[PDB]
């Protein structure tokens, strides 16, 4: 079984919606290109049908292995990678199209098939460029301010740096004629420090 | 509140016991120097007394209750969840657990004098065959260290941990743990 992530060019500009959030140094976006949101809806529908059926699959958990995992947050199956195997016998899974990690049981895992791995994984890890925490850790305040800048919004992302594990982006809100660069907000408000 | 980790010099050899394990690239050790084990016990007893009688922020120190053995230990706040629960990193052992607000207490500054003792380690000069450490590799590493004091040589010191070469000296025949994992096809050479 093999798979890919969404791929970018340096300085590519592309619209995003943030699908998961941990900090300004760690958040996940859907990049709205190549009919992503629609292809991802279609795949998920196909996973519901596939996963729905009796009997389910014998899945053997191994670290970094792809699977289908049930997400109790909304009661549907999604694509996932095994992240951890716990003493209890439960398994933590990384939901690859969204960026959240959940602890599941063995009944909540099913083997994935190669035809469900054609669409690139859509939960792209991001960080804002040119900022750093005032001390050594992102504060709740800095994170909640960031969240209030992106919630319910589509933003322009410029892909400034590409690493193996994700992308550093500059995020701009273009929902009005006054562009708002999210980092500006966080720096101005004293919630984060300039970096670089 | 401010604190430190156990400090080392490059190529320092010191005895260890592994206190928490995740993979050959991520395991935690007590380094047996400067009366560490004894000073940590002493500290833990002081904490049990103090806790027996907190505003969460990411990276903030505290006392947290560990349900595995039912005692209080030093921790840093790692995550704050929607439920209102908090994940804490037990800084003297290296495990992370989800606790409730009742399982947290502020820590006193005098409890932050002993350096934090769960030192993150990785074995130097090896890598996963594919992209991730397998269960078999980790399980074999665990078999090599369970119940054992090993000699560690600190080869590289980073901000976030130490790369070590581990040797079992429990018999006259020294056993370098990486050797075992490489020889048995479980990990690939690196460097």
């Amino acid at each position: 079984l093999e798979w890919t992530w969404v791929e970018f060019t340096v300085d590519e500009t592309v619209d995003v919606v943030v699908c998961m959030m941990y900090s300004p140094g760690e958040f996940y976006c859907h990049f709205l290109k190549d009919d992503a949101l629609e292809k991802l809806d279609d795949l998920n529908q196909s996973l519901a049908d596939y996963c729905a059926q009796k009997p389910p699959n014998g899945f053997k958990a191994e670290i970094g292995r792809p699977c289908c995992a049930f997400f109790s947050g909304d009661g549907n199956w999604y694509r996932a990678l095994v992240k951890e195997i716990l003493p209890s016998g439960n398994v933590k899974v990384h939901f690859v199209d969204y960026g959240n990690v959940e602890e599941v049981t063995t009944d909540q895992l099913q083997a994935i098939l190669p035809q469900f791995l054609l669409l690139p994984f859509q939960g792209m890890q991001c960080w804002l460029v040119d900022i750093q925490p005032p001390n050594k850790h992102w504060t709740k305040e800095a994170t909640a301010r960031f969240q209030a800048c992106v919630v319910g919004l589509k933003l322009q992302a410029r892909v400034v740096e590409i690493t193996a594990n994700g992308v550093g982006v500059e995020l701009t809100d273009l929902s009005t004629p006054y562009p708002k660069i999210i980092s500006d907000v966080l720096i101005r408000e004293q919630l984060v420090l300039r970096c670089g | 509140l401010e604190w430190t980790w156990v400090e080392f010099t490059v190529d320092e050899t010191v005895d260890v016991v592994v206190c928490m394990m995740y993979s050959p690239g991520e395991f935690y050790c007590h380094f047996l120097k400067d009366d560490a084990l004894e000073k940590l016990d002493d500290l833990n007893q002081s904490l049990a007394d103090y806790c027996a009688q907190f505003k969460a922020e990411i990276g903030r120190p505290c006392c947290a209750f560990f349900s595995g053995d039912g005692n209080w230990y030093r921790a840093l706040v790692k995550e704050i969840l929607p439920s209102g629960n908090v994940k804490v990193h037990f800084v003297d052992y290296g495990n992370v657990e989800e606790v409730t607000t009742d399982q947290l207490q502020a820590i006193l500054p005098q409890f932050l004098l002993l350096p934090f003792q769960g030192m993150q380690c990785w074995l130097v000069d090896i890598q996963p065959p594919n992209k991730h450490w397998t269960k078999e590799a980790t399980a074999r590493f665990q078999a090599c260290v369970v119940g054992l004091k090993l000699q560690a040589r600190v080869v590289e010191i980073t901000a976030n941990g130490v790369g070590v070469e581990l040797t079992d000296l429990s018999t006259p025949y020294p056993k370098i743990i990486s050797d075992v994992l490489i020889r048995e096809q479980l990990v690939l050479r690196c460097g």
Partner: peptide
């Protein structure tokens, strides 16, 4: 509650 923000 669904994919809710987790402070890290």
């Amino acid at each position: 509650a669904g994919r809710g923000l987790v402070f890290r």
